[PDB]
């Protein structure tokens, strides 16, 4: 099902695409996993502990 | 044993650099020293995993200098 | 922000260290990369591409008659540097005199071509009847592999390594400091090489 | 006796000054013998040496003006803290 | 040498073609122009917002559906192109029910506003909305801390994303000369020609330290 939802759009099957480095402009040797992850922020701040 | 050991992200790069492959671009040639290996790798004409016989100069402690030819990898020469 | 420099430190006779003023955030790394690749594979020069040694010359290692092997002779002739005038090709002839020690300053020089280093040995001679060698010079721009045939490094520099350190003025804190290490073979100065690289990049940006 | 007595909470382990804590991150540009430190944290820790150097440099005649110059946070207190 | 060739796929996103470069000149020029087109070009944005009925940025005003922070983010979302001058002041007057777009503001002859399909706020009751804005010039990202009066962050960057790729051009020359294409996606404020023009100007001013 995940492979079908990936193949429905103009997206690769394995979920790994080749991205270039922004510092030197060269290409990496392998393809990395790129995607959107639901990332949140905790309550342990740096001002409370320093 | 020393308590300072290289951790996972640097031994991963060292294991990726030290490995050798069978068929890659730029293998079977002879290089003069380490600087020629660096100049060949930085111009993207030789792969990182290639069986390339290089020549390196190292001294031996008991200090006598010597030169030899070893059949190593490009990453091991770097 | 315009940097004030560049300060250069000559710690060796051929290796230098260029210290630039703290630039803006992000300019230092792209300026270091755009100077590094231009210094590496854009500056033209002269090198040795092929040799013609007298004798059998059936293979690259199947030879005898000297103290060292001919492979070490080829690797020592490959690592030497040579400059010339604006002519394209040049043919040189190297011949020894007897069982001694030959250096780089033994080639029959022409008025058009010059030799950089004089104290640089290639092999040791222990027997009589030393053979003569013929050499050819071709002008290139970067690095060329073999594909009697040898490799050639037409670039005048040997190794270029740049690093971005942390330096800050009393007003702002996020500034990048660029330190470039240049190891020229000796045919040109390191500051002159950086100046010609910046001039080449400035012309390539001013054409567009 | 006990863990919360006057022998384990005040004699072996004592609360000390000239000290603080913070979270730690990773720094790849540092060396082995050096580490990082925040600006306000090092200004709070090295405050007596900053006061002594401000009295020696002549920027403040008394320690009250030196303390007000520290809390004003100009560039000279950053020069003193860096030195 | 021949000059940059301009393709027009979208009125907001253009594409430039540079050819013919030598071997080993496409990647460095592409990465340098990409980084400078990303984080060097100055632009115009809204810095402070002065409303008569809104005291601070956490209160609620009668007649408005959204809060004040939504109006501040929608004012941060829009883009303003100014011809001349380093400062400006724009005021808007909209009362009654209906949506409030970016085209409903009062602009000057030199201050040009995009048509603004994105709405700013939603009005329900018959409450007048007198809001004064201020435009300033700058480059990069400036926070509200380090610069009845409100303060808003500003992102002086008209360029959204820059990509490039190096392709080979079959031309009768001494070697294999490669070309490159650069597709610049902006917000309609800056054009793709003066952007790479001021990028080359920034490169020529940065490379003037040597010699």
Curated annotation (Swiss-Prot), chain A:
Superkingdom to which the source organism belongs: Bacteria
Protein name according to UniProt: DNA-directed RNA polymerase subunit beta
Annotated function: DNA-dependent RNA polymerase catalyzes the transcription of DNA into RNA using the four ribonucleoside triphosphates as substrates.
Assembly notes: The RNAP catalytic core consists of 2 alpha, 1 beta, 1 beta' and 1 omega subunit. When a sigma factor is associated with the core the holoenzyme is formed, which can initiate transcription.
Annotated family: Belongs to the RNA polymerase beta chain family.
Organism expressing this protein natively: Xanthomonas oryzae pv. oryzae (strain PXO99A)
Curated annotation (Swiss-Prot), chain B:
Intrachain disulfide bonds: none
Subunit: The RNAP catalytic core consists of 2 alpha, 1 beta, 1 beta' and 1 omega subunit. When a sigma factor is associated with the core the holoenzyme is formed, which can initiate transcription.
Family: Belongs to the RNA polymerase beta' chain family.
Protein role: DNA-dependent RNA polymerase catalyzes the transcription of DNA into RNA using the four ribonucleoside triphosphates as substrates.
Official protein name in the record: DNA-directed RNA polymerase subunit beta'
Taxonomic lineage: Bacteria, Pseudomonadati, Pseudomonadota, Gammaproteobacteria, Lysobacterales
Full protein stretch here: 497 to 579 of 1405
Swiss-Prot record, chain C:
Catalytic activity: RNA(n) + a ribonucleoside 5'-triphosphate = RNA(n+1) + diphosphate
Gene Ontology cellular-component terms listed: cytoplasm; DNA-directed RNA polymerase complex
One GO molecular-function entry: protein dimerization activity
Enzyme type, top EC level: transferase
Record region (Alpha N-terminal domain (alpha-NTD)): 1-208
Quaternary structure note: Homodimer. The RNAP catalytic core consists of 2 alpha, 1 beta, 1 beta' and 1 omega subunit. When a sigma factor is associated with the core the holoenzyme is formed, which can initiate transcription.
Similarity field: Belongs to the RNA polymerase alpha chain family.
Protein name (Swiss-Prot/TrEMBL): DNA-directed RNA polymerase subunit alpha
Organism, scientific name: Xanthomonas oryzae pv. oryzae (strain PXO99A)
Gene name, Swiss-Prot/TrEMBL: rpoA
Shown stretch of the complete protein: 9 to 230 of 332
């Amino acid at each position: 099902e995940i492979k079908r939802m990936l193949e429905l759009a103009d997206l690769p099957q394995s979920g790994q695409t080749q991205l270039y480095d922004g510092r030197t402009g060269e290409a990496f040797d392998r393809k990395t996993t790129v995607g959107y992850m639901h990332y949140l922020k905790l309550n342990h701040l740096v001002d409370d502990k320093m | 044993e020393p308590i300072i050991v290289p951790s996972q992200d640097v031994v991963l790069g060292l294991y990726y650099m030290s490995r050798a492959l069978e068929n890659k671009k730029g293998e079977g040639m002879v290089f003069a020293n380490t600087s020629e290996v660096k100049r060949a790798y930085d111009n993207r004409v030789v792969e990182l995993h290639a069986k390339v016989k290089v020549r390196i100069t190292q001294v031996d402690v008991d200090r006598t200098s010597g030169t030899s030819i070893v059949d190593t990898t490009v990453g091991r020469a770097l | 922000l315009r940097p004030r420099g560049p300060q250069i430190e000559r710690l060796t006779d051929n290796r230098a260290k260029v210290v630039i003023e703290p630039l803006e955030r992000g300019y230092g790394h792209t300026l270091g990369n755009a100077l590094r690749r231009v210094l590496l594979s854009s500056i033209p020069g002269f090198a040795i591409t092929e040799v013609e040694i007298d004798g059998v010359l059936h293979e690259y290692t199947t030879v005898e008659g000297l103290q060292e092997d001919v492979l070490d002779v080829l690797l020592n002739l490959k690592d030497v540097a040579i400059r010339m005038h604006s002519g394209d090709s040049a043919t040189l002839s190297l011949s020894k005199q007897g069982p001694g020690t030959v250096t780089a300053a033994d080639i029959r020089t022409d008025h058009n071509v010059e030799i950089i280093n004089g104290d640089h040995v290639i092999c040791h001679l222990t027997k009589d009847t030393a053979l003569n060698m013929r050499l050819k010079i071709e002008r290139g721009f970067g690095y060329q592999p073999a594909a009697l045939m040898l490799d050639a490094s037409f670039s005048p520099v040997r190794r270029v390594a740049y690093a971005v350190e942390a330096a800050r003025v009393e007003q702002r804190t996020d500034l990048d400091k660029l330190v470039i290490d240049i190891e020229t073979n000796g045919t040109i100065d390191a500051e002159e090489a950086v100046r010609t690289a910046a001039d080449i990049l400035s012309d390539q940006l001013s054409v567009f | 006796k006990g863990k919360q007595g006057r022998f384990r909470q005040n004699l072996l382990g004592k609360r000390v000054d000239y000290s603080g804590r913070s979270v730690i991150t990773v720094g790849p540009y540092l060396k082995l013998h050096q580490c990082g430190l925040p600006k306000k944290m090092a200004l709070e820790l090295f405050k007596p040496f900053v006061f002594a150097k401000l009295q020696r440099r002549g920027l403040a005649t008394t320690i009250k003006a030196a303390k007000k110059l520290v809390e004003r946070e100009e560039a000279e207190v950053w020069d003193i803290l860096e030195e």
